[PDB]
């Protein structure tokens, strides 16, 4: 975990540069140093207490630019630093961290929907391609459990997907897993205990409030309680054994709603509001700044 839930970037009217941190302990939000470049459809992750913002797209009134950028935020300094860029731009990207390396998964570059996957090594400041997924996936949910990487749902250029697959690093190989019971593009995907959770998303017709989880031992998906708000392009993270979902789009409003899931009571509750409604944020947890 760490201490704060950091939300970076996102979309409302145009791509956003906001970096804001929420403190579950007191309900407070802090506005921190803006991203150097606005971006929506990015992912966040943490390695060695540093926050990384990965990929996305700058949707601006002066043009639209898919991002291959990797940028690093140090809470100690309140400063963003550029890292090596990825091989390709990846809007609507998913990311997972294994053994202190960042896996960038899928995403789009204009009409190109990637199946490619690449791995960042912070000691080297270097990206390297690994085996591609079996499926092109943008708006892909990514989680890590037991040092295996999961790519869940998304959009292949033609169809939104219920499919999911797993990457075995020591084999450099992807294999399909049991598909979800729901087609989901732009779901929030995370791990809690022995399960991969997929919350919300878009099925090609409707934004979803439903939530399902994959037990790696049983290889089956089970629905849990739905969120209070239907949402796609949400941010998701885990903080002290609870899932937090941030923002997204319900087909009417860019949501400021933050919901929290308690696995013991199988209930969602409203915990806070983001300072403004937005979709396509990057979210991760690390220590409080300065
Ligand atoms: O299925 C689609 O068209 C993609 C929907 C989508 C939009 C934004 C994000 Cl961040 C993810 C997915």
Swiss-Prot record:
Outcome recorded upon mutating residue 57 to M: Impaired interaction with NFE2L2/NRF2
Residues the UniProt record annotates as site (Sensor for electrophilic agents): 111
Modified residues (S-cGMP-cysteine): 111
Superkingdom in the source lineage: Eukaryota
Post-translational modification: Non-enzymatic covalent modifications of reactive cysteines by electrophile metabolites inactivate the BCR(KEAP1) complex. Accumulation of fumarate promotes the formation of cysteine S-succination (S-(2-succinyl)cysteine), leading to inactivate the BCR(KEAP1) complex and promote NFE2L2/NRF2 nuclear accumulation and activation. Nitric oxide-dependent 8-Nitro-cGMP formation promotes cysteine guanylation (S-cGMP-cysteine), leading to NFE2L2/NRF2 nuclear accumulation and activation. Degraded via a proteasomal-independent process during selective autophagy: interaction with phosphorylated SQSTM1/p62 sequesters KEAP1 in inclusion bodies, leading to its degradation.
Residues recorded as bearing S-(2-succinyl)cysteine in the entry: 290
Effect ascribed to mutating residue 11 to A: Impaired interaction with SQSTM1/p62
Effect of residue 160 to M: Impaired interaction with NFE2L2/NRF2
Membership in a protein family: Belongs to the KEAP1 family.
Quaternary assembly: Component of the BCR(KEAP1) E3 ubiquitin ligase complex, at least composed of 2 molecules of CUL3, 2 molecules of KEAP1, and RBX1. Interacts with NFE2L2/NRF2; the interaction is direct. Forms a ternary complex with NFE2L2/NRF2 and PGAM5. Interacts with (phosphorylated) SQSTM1/p62; the interaction is direct and inactivates the BCR(KEAP1) complex by sequestering it in inclusion bodies, promoting its degradation. Interacts with NFE2L1. Interacts with BPTF and PTMA. Interacts with MAP1LC3B. Interacts indirectly with ENC1. Interacts with SESN1 and SESN2. Interacts with HSP90AA1 and HSP90AB1.
Protein name according to UniProt: Kelch-like ECH-associated protein 1
Natural source organism: Mus musculus
Covered residues, full protein: 324 to 613 of 624
């Amino acid at each position: 975990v760490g201490r704060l839930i950091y939300t970076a970037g996102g979309y409302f009217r145009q791509s956003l540069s906001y970096l804001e941190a929420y403190n579950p302990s007191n309900g407070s939000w802090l506005r921190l140093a803006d991203l150097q470049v606005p971006r929506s459809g990015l992912a966040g992750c943490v390695v060695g207490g540093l926050l990384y913002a990965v990929g996305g797209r700058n949707n601006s009134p002066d043009g639209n630019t898919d991002s291959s950028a990797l940028d690093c935020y140090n809470p100690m300094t309140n400063q963003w630093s550029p890292c090596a860029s990825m091989s390709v731009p990846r809007n609507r990207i998913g990311v997972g961290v294994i053994d202190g390396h960042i896996y960038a998964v899928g995403g789009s570059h204009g009409c190109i929907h990637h199946s490619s996957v690449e791995r960042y090594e912070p000691e080297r400041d270097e990206w390297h391609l690994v085996a591609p997924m079996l499926t092109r996936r943008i708006g892909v949910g990514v989680a890590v459990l037991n040092r295996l990487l999961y790519a869940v749902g998304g959009f292949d250029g033609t169809n939104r997907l219920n499919s999911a697959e797993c990457y075995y690093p020591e084999r450099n190989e992807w294999r399909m897993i049991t598909p979800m019971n729901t087609i989901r593009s732009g779901a929030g995907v995370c791990v809690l205990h022995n399960c991969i959770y997929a919350a919300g998303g878009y099925d090609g017709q409707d934004q979803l409030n439903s939530v399902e989880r994959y037990d790696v031992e049983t290889e089956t998906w089970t629905f849990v309680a739905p969120m209070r708000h239907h949402r796609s392009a949400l941010g998701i993270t885990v903080h002290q054994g609870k899932i937090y979902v941030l923002g997204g789009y319900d087909g009417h409003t860019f949501l400021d709603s933050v919901e929290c899931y308690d696995p013991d009571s199988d209930t969602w509750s409203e915990v806070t509001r983001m300072t403004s409604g937005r979709s396509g944020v990057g979210v991760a947890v690390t220590m409080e700044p300065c």
